[PDB]
Amino acid sequence: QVERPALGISMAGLSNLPSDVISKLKIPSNVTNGIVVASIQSGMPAQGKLKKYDVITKVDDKEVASPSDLQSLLYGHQVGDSITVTFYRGENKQTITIKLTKTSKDLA
Ligand SMILES: [Cl-]
């Protein structure tokens, strides 16, 4: 469904990554469930909000631990909605709001 809102991120689940990859994120040792932001597409809603290596732990105050968990929530929204995101930027536990202003109509 291309009309679904798009953030413009690629992801990896923490539970799927080797120990050495997780150590490079410099997140607290008690953060074991989450989604690493692997890349951000220019001009998409995540740009200027999230950053590469952020580790998302909640969306809309609901815990997420895999790319599919985030997709389930993101796709329950419509364009024009906003989401909250809780994430670790290194040791910093942060929250941000992102307005879902794009669809995937121009992505393939
Ligand atoms: Cl949140």
Side-chain angles (χ1 to χ4, degrees), residues 24-42:
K24 180 177 295 183
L25 301 172
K26 295 183 180 174
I27 61 174
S29 65
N30 63 6
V31 177
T32 59
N33 299 323
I35 307 166
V36 185
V37 176
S39 68
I40 299 185
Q41 182 187 157
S42 63

Side-chain angles (χ1 to χ4, degrees), residues 58-61 84-86:
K58 313 188 298 188
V59 172
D60 291 333
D61 198 43
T84 63
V85 184
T86 299

